[PDB]
Amino acid sequence: AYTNSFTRGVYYPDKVFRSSVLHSTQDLFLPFFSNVTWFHVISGTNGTKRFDNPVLPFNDGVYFASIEKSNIIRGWIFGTTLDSKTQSLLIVNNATNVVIKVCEFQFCNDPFLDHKNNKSWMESEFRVYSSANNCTFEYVSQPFLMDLEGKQGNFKNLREFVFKNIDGYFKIYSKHTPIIVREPEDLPQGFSALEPLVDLPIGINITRFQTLLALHRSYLTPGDSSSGWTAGAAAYYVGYLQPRTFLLKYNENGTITDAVDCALDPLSETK
């Protein structure tokens, strides 16, 4: 399946304060009106569906934006040759802490995390770990990226992610918003910038990408409605990046209002 991205994927530039100016820069942004590959697990509930396990290649960036009320996706592990010689990169954000670790171990190919999302087990049993050989770096931080409230329940939560591989770093952007209950393939038309959170100084050369899905043990009331149990309401979107000039506008406080793709039509070039 495919969808249309009106105007999204515009992250914040370098940490430079600009107010009421029109600055243009060249970086790996997301072009407007682009085709986004939708490879979400169709169902599973009331009709077992095939677990979507897309080994999509990491091509100079990826645009991840999931619409979920409860946490259904945990890991965004990368890699190039995921059999014996590849340093893993776990971005699992459970309830306790983050599991950022680049230790060298046996790489597996399990689509789910372990099993048994019920309350009887822990938050995330690391059954994917076979045997460690030699570790290099582990960022076990307390603040986790997964920040789900789940107060009203009727309104979902859209949390975007922008992953880019720097020559000597690994920048990670994220941004959440209380998206209202809507039908699939109905992304809200509106500008929204992502705030920089962390910057891992890693020097690995990843080429492919393979995520994993895991349901949190904090099982709420049975969501018989469409905005309830999100076991079969995944929104796994993937968008590639490419170099393109963008014109950014700043407000009187330091926030970005909108942006111009600079290549859409002869009218945009004149602007």
Binding site: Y12, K15, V16, F17, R18, V21, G168, Y169, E195, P196, P201, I202, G203, N253, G254
Partner: protein, 168 residues
């Protein structure tokens, strides 16, 4: 224990400093000074450098930005590293100097005019719209313009009835 100096055990720690092809991490420790405010001095922050007067501006920056640019792509706002306070920098004082001479054949008295100053960055002292005029007194009369100064201010070597350059 009852042995010679050739039996003493030596616990040796072998440092192997390594610098490969990846982000470096074991660097060296750094120091700091105090915060001299209101003085045109040099500042050397983590990444930015320069000189000027350090002040305090009422700006609200997002908690991830550290640098600051202006309309002309110039550094104008900074952030205190170990204090998290909004500091504002201003260029050091400067300007031009002009000399008013009524003629060597008449007298040798001259006057100076520092363009762009409020009579504060270094004798009759009078503030005008072009700078600080040092060496002339402002007369409340009105005559013809002889030496144009600026913004309607004119000067002429006149008598005070001793002669001096007067301003009007």
């Amino acid at each position: 224990p009852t042995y010679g100096v050739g039996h003493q055990p030596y616990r040796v720690v072998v440092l192997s400093f390594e610098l490969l092809h990846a982000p470096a991490t074991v660097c060296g420790p750094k120091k700091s000074t105090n915060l001299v405010k209101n003085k045109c001095v040099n500042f050397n922050f983590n990444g930015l450098k320069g000189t000027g007067v350090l002040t305090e501006s009422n700006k609200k920056f997002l908690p991830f930005q550290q640098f600051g640019r202006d309309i002309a792509d110039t550094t104008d706002a900074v952030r205190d590293p170990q204090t998290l306070e909004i500091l504002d920098i201003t260029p050091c004082s400067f300007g031009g100097v002009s000399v008013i001479t009524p003629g060597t054949n008449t007298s040798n008295q001259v006057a100076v005019l520092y363009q762009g100053v409020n009579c504060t960055e270094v004798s009759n002292v009078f503030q005008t719209r072009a700078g600080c005029l040092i060496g002339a007194e402002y007369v409340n009369n009105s005559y013809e313009c002889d030496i144009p100064i600026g913004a309607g201010i004119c000067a002429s070597y006149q008598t005070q009835t001793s002669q001096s350059i007067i301003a009007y």
